[PDB]
Amino acid sequence: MLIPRRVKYRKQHHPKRTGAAKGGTQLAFGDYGIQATEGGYLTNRQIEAARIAMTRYIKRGGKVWINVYPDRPMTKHPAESRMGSGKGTPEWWIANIKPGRVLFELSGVPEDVAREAMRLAIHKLPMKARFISREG
Amino acid sequence: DVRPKITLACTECKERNYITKKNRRNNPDRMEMAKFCPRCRKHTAHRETR
Amino acid sequence: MKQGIHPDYRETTVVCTCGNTFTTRSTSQSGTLNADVCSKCHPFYTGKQKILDAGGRVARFERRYG
Amino acid sequence: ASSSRNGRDSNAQRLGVKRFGGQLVNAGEIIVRQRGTHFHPGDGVGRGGDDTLFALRDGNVEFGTRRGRRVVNVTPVE
Amino acid sequence: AHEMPRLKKQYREQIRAAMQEEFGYRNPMLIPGLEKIVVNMGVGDAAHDSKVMDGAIRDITAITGQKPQVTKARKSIAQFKLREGQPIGCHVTLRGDRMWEFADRLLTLALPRIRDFRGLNSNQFDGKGNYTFGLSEQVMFLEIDQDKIDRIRGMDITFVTTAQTNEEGKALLKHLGFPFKAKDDPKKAKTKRGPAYYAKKKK
RNA sequence: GUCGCCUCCUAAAGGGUAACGGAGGCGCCCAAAGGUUCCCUCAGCCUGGUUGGUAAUCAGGUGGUGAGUGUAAGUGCACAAGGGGGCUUGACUGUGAGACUGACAGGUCGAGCAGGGACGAAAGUCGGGACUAGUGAUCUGACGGUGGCUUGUGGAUGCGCC
RNA sequence: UUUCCGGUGGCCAUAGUGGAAGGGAAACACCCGGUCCCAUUCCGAACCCGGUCGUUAAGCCUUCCAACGCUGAUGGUACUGCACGAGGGAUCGUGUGGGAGAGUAAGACGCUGCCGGAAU
RNA sequence: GCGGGGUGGAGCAGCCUGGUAGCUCGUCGGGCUCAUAACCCGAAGGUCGUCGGUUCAAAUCCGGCCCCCGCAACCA
Ligand SMILES: [Mg+2]
Ligand SMILES: [Mg+2]
Ligand SMILES: [Mg+2]
Ligand SMILES: [Mg+2]
Ligand SMILES: [Mg+2]
Ligand SMILES: [Mg+2]
Ligand SMILES: [Mg+2]
Ligand SMILES: [Mg+2]
Ligand SMILES: [Mg+2]
Ligand SMILES: [Mg+2]
Ligand SMILES: [Mg+2]
Ligand SMILES: [Mg+2]
Ligand SMILES: [Mg+2]
Ligand SMILES: [Mg+2]
Ligand SMILES: [Mg+2]
Ligand SMILES: [Mg+2]
Ligand SMILES: [Mg+2]
Ligand SMILES: [Mg+2]
Ligand SMILES: [Mg+2]
Ligand SMILES: [Mg+2]
Ligand SMILES: [Zn+2]
Ligand SMILES: [Zn+2]
Numbered sequence A: 001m002l003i004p005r006r007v008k009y010r011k012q013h014h015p016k017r018t019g020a021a022k023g024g025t026q027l028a029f030g031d032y033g034i035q036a037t038e039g040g041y042l043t044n045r046q047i048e049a050a051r052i053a054m055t056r057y058i059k060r061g062g063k064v065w066i067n068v069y070p071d072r073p074m075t076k077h078p079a080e081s082r083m084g085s086g087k088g089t090p091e092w093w094i095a096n097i098k099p100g101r102v103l104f105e106l107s108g109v110p111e112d113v114a115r116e117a118m119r120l121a122i123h124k125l126p127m128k129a130r131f132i133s134r135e136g
Numbered sequence B: 001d002v003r004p005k006i007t008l009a010c011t012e013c014k015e016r017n018y019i020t021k022k023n024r025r026n027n028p029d030r031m032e033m034a035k036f037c038p039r040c041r042k043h044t045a046h047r048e049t050r
Numbered sequence C: 001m002k003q004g005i006h007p008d009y010r011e012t013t014v015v016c017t018c019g020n021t022f023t024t025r026s027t028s029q030s031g032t033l034n035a036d037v038c039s040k041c042h043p044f045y046t047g048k049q050k051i052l053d054a055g056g057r058v059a060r061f062e063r064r065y066g
Numbered sequence D: 001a002s003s004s005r006n007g008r009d010s011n012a013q014r015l016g017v018k019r020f021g022g023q024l025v026n027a028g029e030i031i032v033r034q035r036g037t038h039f040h041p042g043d044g045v046g047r048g049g050d051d052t053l054f055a056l057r058d059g060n061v062e063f064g065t066r067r068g069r070r071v072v073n074v075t076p077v078e
Numbered sequence E: 001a002h003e004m005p006r007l008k009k010q011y012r013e014q015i016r017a018a019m020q021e022e023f024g025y026r027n028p029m030l031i032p033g034l035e036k037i038v039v040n041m042g043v044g045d046a047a048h049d050s051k052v053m054d055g056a057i058r059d060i061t062a063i064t065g066q067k068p069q070v071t072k073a074r075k076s077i078a079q080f081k082l083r084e085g086q087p088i089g090c091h092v093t094l095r096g097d098r099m100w101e102f103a104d105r106l107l108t109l110a111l112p113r114i115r116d117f118r119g120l121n122s123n124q125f126d127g128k129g130n131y132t133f134g135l136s137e138q139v140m141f142l143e144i145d146q147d148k149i150d151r152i153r154g155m156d157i158t159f160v161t162t163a164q165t166n167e168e169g170k171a172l173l174k175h176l177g178f179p180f181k182a183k184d185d186p187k188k189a190k191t192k193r194g195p196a197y198y199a200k201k202k203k
Numbered sequence F: 001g002u003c004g005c006c007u008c009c010u011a012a013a014g015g016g017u018a019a020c021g022g023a024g025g026c027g028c029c030c031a032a033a034g035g036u037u038c039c040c041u042c043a044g045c046c047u048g049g050u051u052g053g054u055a056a057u058c059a060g061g062u063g064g065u066g067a068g069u070g071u072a073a074g075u076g077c078a079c080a081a082g083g084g085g086g087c088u089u090g091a092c093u094g095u096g097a098g099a100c101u102g103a104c105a106g107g108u109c110g111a112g113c114a115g116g117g118a119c120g121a122a123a124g125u126c127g128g129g130a131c132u133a134g135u136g137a138u139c140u141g142a143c144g145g146u147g148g149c150u151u152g153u154g155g156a157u158g159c160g161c162c
Numbered sequence G: 001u002u003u004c005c006g007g008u009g010g011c012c013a014u015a016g017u018g019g020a021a022g023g024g025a026a027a028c029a030c031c032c033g034g035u036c037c038c039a040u041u042c043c044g045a046a047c048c049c050g051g052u053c054g055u056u057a058a059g060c061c062u063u064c065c066a067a068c069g070c071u072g073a074u075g076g077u078a079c080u081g082c083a084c085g086a087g088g089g090a091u092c093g094u095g096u097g098g099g100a101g102a103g104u105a106a107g108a109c110g111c112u113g114c115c116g117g118a119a120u
Numbered sequence H: 001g002c003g004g005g006g007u008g009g010a011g012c013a014g015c016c017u018g019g020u021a022g023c024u025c026g027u028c029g030g031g032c033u034c035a036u037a038a039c040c041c042g043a044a045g046g047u048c049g050u051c052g053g054u055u056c057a058a059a060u061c062c063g064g065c066c067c068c069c070g071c072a073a074c075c076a
Helices: A044-058 A111-122 C057-065 E006-023 E051-064 E096-113 E166-176 E184-198
Strands: A032-036 A040-043 A063-066 A072-076 A089-097 A102-107 A129-133 B005-010 B018-021 B032-037 B042-048 C013-015 C021-023 D030-033 D045-047 D053-055 D059-066 D069-075 E034-042 E069-072 E087-094 E131-135 E155-161
Touching (some): A044 A089, A044 A111, A102 A111, A111 A129, D030 D069, D045 D069, E006 E096, E034 E051, E034 E096, E155 E166
Antiparallel strands (some): A032 A129, A040 A089, E034 E087, E034 E155, E069 E087
């Protein structure tokens, strides 16, 4: 589970989820990758599930890059309580995903099994994503 | 209580012209200043009242 | 120099009790100083020494046996 | 339940430029209220105790640069 | 009195000629020379009393011949137990005639009578033609008394010369005459203690 | 849990803008940490050096703001508003053209002038503090000054003014 | 009149930083002294005073170097006022006006005023 | 939620506030005794639950966290 060591402010406004990907729309480390076609919030649990799926399928070879980091904290109102009495305590850590953002990258693996591993990973994400490559 | 209000009166016409503050611990004794005395119509030595 | 804040720094010869005598305006209120040893009268570099060591471990053996 | 350790804030101070570029002003008229010298006093402009820039003379307000400083000048009226 | 010192005269004639011939400076005012002498002593065990500073002032005044600048603590440190603004050290800057005659006195008299004196390392230059070293004990300066010193103290002696490079600084200070150049002993202990402490792990 | 004041964010590039929204501060302190005049440049890093160590004091090199600012934060400040020395009391009296900001009470800035000063060779600056919190209307009472009024007159007494 | 240089402004990196080469007639400077005014929280280092011998090594000045930094379009894109439209919904699109930041080509080894100097 | 507590082996002091961590018992070494207990003479023993901050300096000040308590968790 990716959790930042510290943050300046633990209670933050909800991240903007408008617009396309600000940056990181192209592969930078690996040969293949996952590119999100829809925006949304990506929690550390989802990131870990996808990473486990990719690594487990590719076994021992190849290396995986997690381009996004769940450094944005999300508070939760205390359960069964009326509205008010200040903001809640951080409960989830998310990354702000926008369309075109490359989430995961993979290298050192043949294309077919890389594609299958990316499929396994994508079936764990909460937003639509696609397999991309450096045109082979 | 530790920075009391002290009143400066002219040493010529004994007139409580000014009021200010000291430290009592940093300045235990009565303070001497040259201020303008409106009655004496010039700069006269002013002393803290006792 | 500021007047009244510095010590007396008048002339001062120096007899090194070893054939060497100079003159420097030191702080010796009396005057000339008396050197137990100069630099040109000292065993350090005038060469008057040469300890190095005594590393002849075998040389000791034939000294007491050869 | 719970409570907030916040909720305090200071009253609005209403800073900012009060007379913009080219606006005719009288002597002593306040040009900008500010904290610190984001604008330095230029020609015909004085700076007060709380860094307020005010007009030293009648004329038109202009914002410019004097050496390396952002300054506010009052050009005397033609 | 008005008399240009022996060491200054020797410097000018012999050393300026020697440097001009064996460094080949293309300009006459490029031959290095002594710029200043700095006598420091950090007496950091003055955070608990003032008498040690008074003794240090007396000692340095007698040794040099002028009143020292007393430096107050730039920042307070608990583990050194010093507050802000306490006097923790004193130093003297010597130039011109005082520089020349103090250097002459030091070299001709004082360090000769160091206990088991073996010379000074040639590898204590700052890397810019200036050479600083340290004396562990003070009364060896026979210009002071012997049976009234409050406690033994040490000091740092720094020769700042107008020398661009370390090799020419070493040449200048040799020609002026400094026990050193030997070989190991100097550079030896040098390398040693160097490596030794030089590590660091405040973390 | 909160209630007044100050700084930031929310606040949507003037100002303003709510919530038991998100962060912190204030109820002081300083006779210098005020005024003026002159001088100075830091932190960090690298190298050398008695005690001495990551770091005391010293030297050289580097280094433009990352240090510093009595105290929160922001806006400022290296031209320093940061560091140091000299002399001082303007932490004045009588004032306030002209503006800022509030429903109002109110809060804030202020040129110029006179008196009498401080500093500076002068130009000049000085009506506390780099700026913005460190505060409480009115009533009633109190002390000091003044002597306007005082119920027949003169006192007294009481009140008024500051 | 011109050229060169010393002062003093303006623009405040297109000017800086770094490297290379060369220059001093006046001038500037380092430099040489400290007797004299004056000065160092020690030091004639600095400040100040007296000289202008020595020296162009440095400051300074001239030429050269896009190397770091700086400057930087056009077009496109983001965003956006107004007017609409589409999705179950996060949200997205279009019309009509405005229009960046980044990046690209490129610019650039400063510009300009006054006074003085030596020569013309 | 409010308030308190966490310090040698144990049970308890040191907390307005910074700088010197104490008493009792127990542990260990020596006496006394035939031996043990008791008693007598000497010694060691906690960098203060943990993370971080304030500050020249933190057991002490501030916050988070863990553990143990107490209280509250109400009206239909
Ligand atoms: Mg990018
Ligand atoms: Mg002011
Ligand atoms: Mg004020
Ligand atoms: Mg606004
Ligand atoms: Mg708006
Ligand atoms: Mg409203
Ligand atoms: Mg200052
Ligand atoms: Mg006052
Ligand atoms: Mg008015
Ligand atoms: Mg206010
Ligand atoms: Mg006046
Ligand atoms: Mg005068
Ligand atoms: Mg202040
Ligand atoms: Mg001030
Ligand atoms: Mg009433
Ligand atoms: Mg009547
Ligand atoms: Mg009045
Ligand atoms: Mg551009
Ligand atoms: Mg552009
Ligand atoms: Mg009931
Ligand atoms: Zn009077
Ligand atoms: Zn001798």
